[model samples]
Target: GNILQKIENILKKIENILWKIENILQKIEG
Candidate 1:
């Protein structure tokens, strides 16, 4: 259970980073 929770946290952080990158790309395209 602890390992699974750590993985989930890592994935959430990665998703947040990806989202920020996407927002930057959109702004650049606009």
Candidate 2:
């Protein structure tokens, strides 16, 4: 259970960073 929470937090951060990077790239080229 504790490890699940840890992974969830990491996945959340990864999702946030991925979406942010995509938006930044779109803004630059589009």
Candidate 3:
């Protein structure tokens, strides 16, 4: 259970980073 929880935390971080990249791309393209 602990290992799975850690994995989920990292996954959330990755998702947040991806969102940040997408927002930056939109701003640059506009």
RMSD of 2: 1.5
lDDT value, residue 27 of candidate 2: 100
Estimate TM-scores for all models.
Answer: 0.88, 0.79, 0.90
Q: Pairs clashing in candidate 2?
A: none
**Per-model lDDT:** 0.99, 0.98, 0.99
Task: Output the lDDT of residue 18, model 1.
Answer: 100
Rank order (by TM-score, best first): 3, 1, 2
Per-residue accuracy of model 3 over 1-30 as CA lDDT, tens digit each:
699999999999999999999999999999
Query: 1-30 in candidate 1: lDDT tens per residue?
Result: 699999999999999999999999999999
Clashes of each: 0, 0, 0
Span of ten consecutive residues with least summed lDDT in model 2: 1-10
Off by over 4 Å in 2: none
- lDDT per residue for candidate 2 within 1-30, as digits (tens), equals 699999999999999999999999999998
In model 3, which residue pairs have backbone atoms overlapping below 3 Å?
none
Clashing pairs in 1: none
